[PDB]
Design an enzyme around this catalytic site. Structure first.
Site, short mmCIF file in Angstrom:
data_model
loop_
_atom_site.label_atom_id
_atom_site.label_comp_id
_atom_site.label_asym_id
_atom_site.label_seq_id
_atom_site.Cartn_x
_atom_site.Cartn_y
_atom_site.Cartn_z
N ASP A 1 53.35 41.27 23.38
CA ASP A 1 53.35 41.64 24.65
C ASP A 1 52.44 41.13 26.04
O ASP A 1 51.76 39.64 25.71
CB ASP A 1 51.79 42.99 23.88
CG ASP A 1 52.36 43.48 22.02
OD1 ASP A 1 52.93 44.00 22.82
OD2 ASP A 1 51.57 43.22 22.03
N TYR B 1 64.73 45.72 36.34
CA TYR B 1 64.32 44.00 35.89
C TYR B 1 64.70 44.39 33.96
O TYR B 1 65.10 43.51 33.63
CB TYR B 1 63.21 43.56 36.51
CG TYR B 1 62.74 42.24 35.71
CD1 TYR B 1 63.89 41.13 35.82
CD2 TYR B 1 62.01 42.14 33.98
CE1 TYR B 1 62.88 39.91 35.26
CE2 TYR B 1 61.14 40.75 34.12
CZ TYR B 1 61.33 39.92 34.28
OH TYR B 1 61.37 38.51 33.98
N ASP C 1 55.32 31.38 34.25
CA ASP C 1 55.10 32.28 32.97
C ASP C 1 55.18 31.40 32.18
O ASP C 1 55.99 30.03 31.75
CB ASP C 1 56.57 32.64 32.92
CG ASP C 1 57.38 33.62 31.62
OD1 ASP C 1 56.35 33.98 30.83
OD2 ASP C 1 57.98 34.25 31.78
N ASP D 1 53.88 42.04 33.31
CA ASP D 1 54.21 41.46 34.86
C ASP D 1 53.88 42.08 35.66
O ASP D 1 53.26 42.74 35.69
CB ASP D 1 55.43 41.47 33.95
CG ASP D 1 55.97 40.47 33.71
OD1 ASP D 1 55.33 39.30 32.57
OD2 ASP D 1 57.72 40.68 34.07
C1 EQU Z 1 61.00 33.11 25.22
C2 EQU Z 1 60.44 35.11 25.09
C3 EQU Z 1 61.03 35.86 25.13
C4 EQU Z 1 60.85 36.58 26.64
C5 EQU Z 1 59.97 36.81 27.24
C6 EQU Z 1 58.51 35.95 26.61
C7 EQU Z 1 57.18 36.00 27.76
C8 EQU Z 1 57.27 36.16 28.64
C9 EQU Z 1 58.83 37.41 29.53
C10 EQU Z 1 58.21 37.39 30.55
C11 EQU Z 1 59.23 38.04 31.51
O1 EQU Z 1 58.70 38.68 32.40
C12 EQU Z 1 60.83 38.18 30.58
C13 EQU Z 1 60.95 37.78 29.07
C14 EQU Z 1 59.68 37.42 28.87
C15 EQU Z 1 58.74 35.19 25.53
C16 EQU Z 1 58.00 33.80 25.33
C17 EQU Z 1 58.84 33.22 23.50
C18 EQU Z 1 60.30 34.00 23.68
O2 EQU Z 1 60.68 34.24 22.74
#
Ligand code: EQU
Ligand code: EQU
Lengths: 128, 125
Positions: B98, B14, B38, B101
């Site tokens: 940082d 992923y 998220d 997940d």
């Molecule tokens: C969207 C993002 C890039 C990717 C990303 C973010 C936050 C949580 C994530 C969780 C994921 O499992 C995969 C990608 C992201 C960021 C929040 C701010 C940003 O630029």
């Protein structure tokens, strides 16, 4: 509920307590009605008394160490997740176990729930 | 359900897909009716269409990089948690975030739920 920054502080302190093995101090961080799932997937441990027995069994024996291996990730609803490593001696074998704990705190700043993600795939023979 | 080892592989895959912005492949990793929270704390979105729209807005640019910063922790009941870092642009300047997940996989090996733990305290310039 504790703020995101407060959660970072609380979860980091928890690891410090586990590292030194202060069982009573660890138990005090939990709400008297907290639940612990460690490892996640197993039946939960309910309440202060059962939680105390759990930590005494895990930390009251051979030397055990614990340290954050990355920053605490904190949310805005009193929750957080953190990556850490636990070191121990398994029947003569020096081992390391990678774990991620997810915690939810209550309005009193105490741990309401703790879930420890790990399994044997996260274990490895390694010197301290 | 995926075994602990299988969970580790799926979650690592992923991240690789996120790193290259393969939205189509990411969406297919999710169950058709999966949920995503998220950052965790916000209302969950439901279903592949909503999830696809979410990833398109987050990775659409193409300047987002992502990599595991530690091993995937996996359970024996199809769940896992992983620490990673994402790099993007914040206020016209390179930044890093940082994240951790937590995912639960179903009996078909697809992601049923994803929860991304992070907040501004995890954003660095
Ligand atoms: C969207 C993002 C890039 C990717 C990303 C973010 C936050 C949580 C994530 C969780 C994921 O499992 C995969 C990608 C992201 C960021 C929040 C701010 C940003 O630029
Ligand atoms: C009990 C244990 C030592 C401490 C410990 C383990 C696993 C997950 C943990 C999660 C915690 O939040 C605090 C301590 C542990 C190890 C499992 C094998 C072992 O020796």
């Amino acid at each position: 509920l504790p703020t995101a920054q407060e959660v970072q502080g609380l979860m980091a302190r928890y690891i410090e307590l586990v590292d030194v093995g202060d069982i009573e101090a660890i138990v005090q961080m939990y709400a008297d009605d907290a639940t612990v799932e460690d490892p996640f997937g197993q039946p939960p441990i309910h309440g202060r008394e059962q939680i105390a027995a759990f930590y005494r069994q895990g930390l009251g024996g051979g030397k055990v160490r614990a340290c954050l291996t990355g920053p605490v990730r904190a949310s805005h609803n009193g929750c957080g997740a953190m990556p850490f490593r636990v070191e121990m001696v398994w029947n003569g074998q020096p081992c390391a176990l990678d774990v991620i704990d997810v915690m939810r705190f209550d309005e009193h700043g105490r741990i309401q729930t703790m879930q420890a993600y790990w399994s044997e795939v996260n274990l490895s023979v390694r010197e301290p």
